[PDB]
Design a protein around this ligand. Structure first.
Ligand code: P6L
Lengths: 504, 218
């Protein structure tokens, strides 16, 4: 039967009396509501093509609601999607996204949603019709269910596609997305909205804009939510955005929540918490201050202890501790709280195998900071820091004759020589450092091409040279030749230290 | 779906495993119709490398001359990650050489190369290394930044791989970075594999004709 009905309405959908074509349309929308007829339509190119073209260029709300509704119904079948696709309905649907009337928007977006999901070529198609701009613009609507489908569409278009991302960025996507996270409590919506942000946060143009739109503070509100899937998009996103956030204010709550999550039963929540904290405390003194204040140092040491040999955890955690123990008002209390909270021995333990270079680099940098506090000078020696630090130094120096596990061995030379430079502020430490027969190396290191290696080498010989026999030992090693040639060096540090050694 | 569009393209450029595995065995079969086990393996590797250059019909000799060995290693490693049983080893032909045999016949150098490939296979099975990431690494290995459209394909495949693993392995905060760190391990094993084979060549152990040495010498 239906096969005879169709060719009829097809002809009426092309008539010139908008009342005819309008009645043709109200007709067909009803037919698509039934299994059999609907199948007849999507098997009829002429008809489908006719429905799209009517929905495109029309100006009757009613015919718009019925053509859009019709495509919605065909869009539930694989061959329906295929008909809408071949028939050029994607551009018309993207036009319907301009509609004021809320029944049309619903139909257009859902149809577009099924297309994006199950129909190959639809993504490219929807982009070429300027669908992204339209979808971002619809983000100021207030039907949260509607907003759920829209953000889901953006996510599908955004995924693994840097081009589309940059497009969403340019339409104001970040601010609109962040505003959703600040406004609604619908888990499904917040979940879909956080995937878009997740996907967008890996793009280096999008990352700053999201941060700028107060994205981190907004994601911060959702970290305690019951929904594990929502909470994991937020941690993913926060982690991606956090290398680019030294600017922000209003961060007190987020940092606070971050410290608490350090105690999570969930090894992954814990891992991301450390990473974000590491990231937010890096070269940002106000964050160092706030994290220290809610017991961050205590929480981070507990975390390193709990993780044992799990470097996915200790490495971000050590990194944060390294940030927290330098260059801020409370840096000193923190170098102490690390010891006070039974952190020294474990920090030094991490220098040994099975630890890999990334952890080792981080730990070396933390030990250098801990040493700035004289009350750690003795504890760090008792634990065996120095022999290990020297062992790593000679091992990385010899290996300079590219990126081993992500780490340049020339970073292990520098970091090790620097940790010793600070440790050497204590005479007992200086006796030990000399003992290990280090002087010839420090002198060899003076010829290193890297300015920063010269600096730390010249720095440790300088701390050693405050002792007569040491000062002479250094002379006897051919130090006075390279040392002098360093007096005329670009950066002050190498110059001043070189002078201080010569001085003796 | 759940797979970026680029990764879907690359997956469409993959060869038919069960087809090229019979073609290769049916080639070595008629080859003994002598030469040593090492000579069989040289011939096999030779053939595998032919499949690999064929496969490289997708999105030339300056590149192939960079990674031919890295590609051959990466192929071998992925076979062990997928089909690998414990204690043995699977070749592109299907054979299952036990490590008992490897340690019994083969010498020190080759046993070390095997040990390194097993540290890698372990690592990748632990990461849950899958086909989609596999093909991504191929292209990242082929399209080296160490030899125009390269930076291009590198940026793009990076982007897609990063999204793919973030979304498909959420519980592994660190996966993307971990995979990328296998690339310099593969190169290091490929450098030791070239040197070992170079010495076999200087000693007449390599068959009169083989693609590997041609590539090595260029
Ligand atoms: C898995 C890592 C690769 C190892 C070999 C690398 C470079 C060589 C490439 C071409 C040929 C492969 C050589 C494999 C060993 C060889 O075929 O047969 C060996 C014995 O056979 C058995 O152990 C049993 C059979 C064992 C089969 C080996 C399985 C792996 C083969 C494919 C791997 C990928 C292709 C390599 C690409 C690299 C570039 C050339 C002979 O050992 P020997 O040379 O005397 O050691 C002496 C020593 O190292 C003297 O001191």
């Amino acid at each position: 039967l239906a096969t005879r009905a169709i060719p009829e309405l097809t002809k009426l959908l092309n008539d010139e009396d908008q009342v005819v074509v309008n009645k043709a349309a109200v007709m067909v929308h009803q037919l698509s509501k039934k299994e059999a007829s609907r199948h007849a339509i999507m098997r009829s190119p002429q008809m489908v093509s006719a429905i799209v073209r009517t929905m495109q260029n029309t100006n009757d709300v009613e015919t718009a609601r019925c053509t859009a509704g019709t495509l919605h119904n065909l869009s539930h079948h694989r061959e329906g999607l295929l008909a809408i696709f071949k028939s050029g309905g994607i551009p018309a649907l993207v036009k319907m996204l301009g509609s004021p009337v809320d029944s049309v928007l619903f139909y257009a977006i859902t149809t577009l949603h099924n297309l994006l999901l199950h129909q190959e070529g639809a993504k490219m198609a929807v982009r070429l019709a300027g669908g992204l701009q339209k979808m971002v613009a619809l983000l100021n609507k207030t039907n949260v269910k509607f907003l759920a489908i829209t953000t889901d569409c953006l996510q599908i278009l955004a995924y693994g596609n840097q081009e589309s991302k940059l497009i969403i960025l340019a339409s104001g996507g970040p601010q609109a997305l962040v505003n959703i996270m600040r406004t609604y409590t619908y888990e499904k919506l917040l979940w879909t909205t956080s995937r878009v942000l997740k996907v967008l946060s890996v793009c280096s143009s999008n990352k700053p804009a999201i941060v700028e739109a107060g994205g981190m503070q907004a994601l911060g509100l959702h970290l305690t939510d019951p929904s594990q899937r929502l909470v994991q998009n937020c941690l993913w996103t926060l982690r991606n955005l956090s290398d680019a956030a030294t600017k922000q204010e209003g961060m007190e709550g987020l940092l606070g929540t971050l410290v608490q999550l350090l105690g999570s039963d969930d090894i992954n929540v814990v891992t991301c918490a450390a990473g974000i904290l590491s990231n937010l405390t890096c070269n940002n003194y106000k964050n160092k201050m706030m994290v220290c204040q809610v017991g961050g140092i205590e929480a981070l040491v507990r975390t390193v202890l709990r993780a044992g040999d799990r470097e996915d955890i200790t490495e971000p955690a050590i990194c944060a501790l390294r940030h927290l123990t330098s260059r801020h008002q409370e840096a000193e209390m923190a170098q102490n709280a690390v010891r006070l909270h039974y952190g020294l021995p474990v920090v030094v333990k991490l220098l040994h195998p099975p630890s890999h270079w990334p952890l080792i680099k981080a730990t070396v940098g933390l030990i250098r900071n801990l040493a700035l506090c004289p009350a750690n000078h003795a504890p760090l020696r008792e634990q065996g820091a120095i022999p290990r630090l020297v062992q790593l130094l000679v091992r990385a120096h010899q290996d300079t004759q590219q990126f081993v596990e992500g780490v340049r061995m020339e970073e292990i030379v520098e970091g090790c020589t620097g940790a010793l430079h600070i440790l050497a502020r204590d005479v007992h430490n200086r006796i030990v450092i000399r003992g290990l027969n280090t002087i010839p190396l420090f002198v060899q290191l003076l010829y290193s091409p890297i300015e920063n290696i010269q600096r730390v080498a010249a720095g440790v010989l300088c701390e050693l040279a405050q002792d007569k026999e040491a000062a002479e030992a250094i002379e006897a090693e051919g130090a006075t030749a390279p040392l002098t040639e360093l007096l005329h060096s670009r950066n002050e540090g190498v110059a001043t230290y070189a002078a201080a050694v010569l001085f003796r | 779906a759940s797979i970026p569009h680029l990764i879907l393209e690359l997956l469409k450029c993959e060869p038919d495993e069960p087809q090229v595995q019979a073609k290769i065995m049916a080639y070595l079969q008629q080859e003994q119709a002598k030469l040593s086990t090492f000579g069989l393996m040289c011939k096999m590797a030779d053939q595998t490398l032919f499949s690999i250059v064929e496969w490289a019909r997708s999105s030339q000799m300056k590149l192939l001359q960079n990674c031919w060995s890295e590609l051959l290693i990466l192929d071998h490693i992925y076979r062990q990650v997928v089909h690998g049983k414990e204690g043995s080893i699977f070749l592109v032909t299907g054979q299952q050489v036990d490590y008992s045999i490897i340690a019994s016949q083969a010498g020190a150098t080759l046993n070390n190369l095997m040990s390194h490939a097993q540290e890698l296979v372990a690592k990748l099975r632990s990461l849950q290394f899958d086909q989609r990431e596999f093909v991504c690494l191929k292209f990242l290995v082929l399209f080296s930044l160490d030899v125009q459209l390269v930076e291009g394909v590198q940026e793009q495949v990076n982007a897609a791989l990063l999204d793919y693993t973030m979304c498909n392995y959420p519980q592994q905060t660190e996966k993307f970075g971990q995979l990328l760190l296998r690339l310099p391990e593969i190169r290091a094993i490929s450098m030791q594999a070239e040197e070992y084979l170079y010495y076999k060549h200087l000693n007449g152990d390599v068959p009169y004709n083989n693609l590997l040495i041609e590539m090595l010498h260029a």
